[PDB]
Amino acid sequence: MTYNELIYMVLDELKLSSDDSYYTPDHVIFLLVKYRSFLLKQRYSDIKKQIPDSDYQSICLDLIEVPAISGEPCEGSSYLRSKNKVPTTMMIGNPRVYPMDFYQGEITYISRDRMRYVGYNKFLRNIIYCSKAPDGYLYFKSWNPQFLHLEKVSFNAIFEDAKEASEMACPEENGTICKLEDKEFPIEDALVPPLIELVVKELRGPEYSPKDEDNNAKDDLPDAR
Amino acid sequence: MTYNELIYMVLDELKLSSDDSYYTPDHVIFLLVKYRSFLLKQRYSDIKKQIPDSDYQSICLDLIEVPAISGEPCEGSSYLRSKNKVPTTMMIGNPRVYPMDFYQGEITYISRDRMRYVGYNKFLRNIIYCSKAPDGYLYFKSWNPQFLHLEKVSFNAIFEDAKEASEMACPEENGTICKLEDKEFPIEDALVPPLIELVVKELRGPEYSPKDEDNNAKDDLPDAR
């Protein structure tokens, strides 16, 4: 299913058909994307369960060498990092950066705190480690100077905001999909009715609520105007 | 998501669209920032859980050498401290001061009470310790005279008030974001629906309540005016 199908299921269950509606499809996209993460956390944070392939998304990154702090000689070894800021992953699935082949390569996505200290083990000096810095970028670290030649990677994870990760998908075979509405929404079909009814309950009450509808330099809501 | 998206989600669910509304967006910012800390404490103070990267913020500090009390010779060794007052961190995440490189440096953020007594261990004489004094400033302490050359640090933590810490973020690559509304709100997507419904419940009742709406040198509320 696509963003369009879910959006219009919500709009039609609310019957927000007219162009002169207070609640536009943008409200629906926002609520759907937030309730997706809400449900995914409620389902897959208590105890460890199998996560379906539907919850995952591959964002698609270009890496650039950057200094550790600045261009100084003693500021430490340099890192690669993604050109653009990366979405925050949720901590429930199998995050993975891979070199355009999911079935190949060993690039490890770890925590920020762990990545301060990695690679000291002599047998772990050739492993590339990844983590999202507080800057918002995905940083890479390794003790093997070869890692600085890496140009492109794909990052597959259950990203915390589906819209951000959908804007950064890799090109499909046909080509890029400009409209987010034509892209696929990242959630399992078993969790679609819960998500829809939560969003419809969210917007049902506000749908029929009054407005400050007179232009009289006055607040008209206490009068149910 | 930004402050703008959350603010207008709340305003639209309350339908506070007219400029002549009693409850402005400022009320919404205040309530959102307080309910964020409320929820973050309710979720992550009972027992220790993983905190997502979304709850964190990096404020960005300039340090200055200051005397311990005054300029006297016997008043003890001097400290560095941030030029401006620092927000209070909540005690739930991984507070960290770092030297413009999250993956490098060892500057320890500890409690005020502990920092009275640190560094006596001969192997811990070169560790820089941080704590927010009751003055409101972040103070630094070490037995290594080299620490007094430190000029700049970044402090990444789950700050207790998101607005204060958003005013003090480091510059982005593009540049500073003047409007708070254009900045990112520091909360995980799974906790956004709870926060929104708490704020909307907070302001739903008051939205429709009466006013002392006549100018007659009289209190008009007992009459539901």
Binding site: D46, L198, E202, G205 | -
Partner: peptide, 28 residues
């Protein structure tokens, strides 16, 4: 009006708690 954010998660939490009790009564 209605909204199921806090209601859903409290119900889920209750079910998780009786979940843990049930599994904690399990013995090999």
């Amino acid at each position: 009006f209605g909204s199921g954010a806090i209601g859903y998660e409290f119900d889920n939490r209750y079910l998780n708690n009786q979940e843990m009790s049930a599994v904690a009564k399990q013995r090999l």
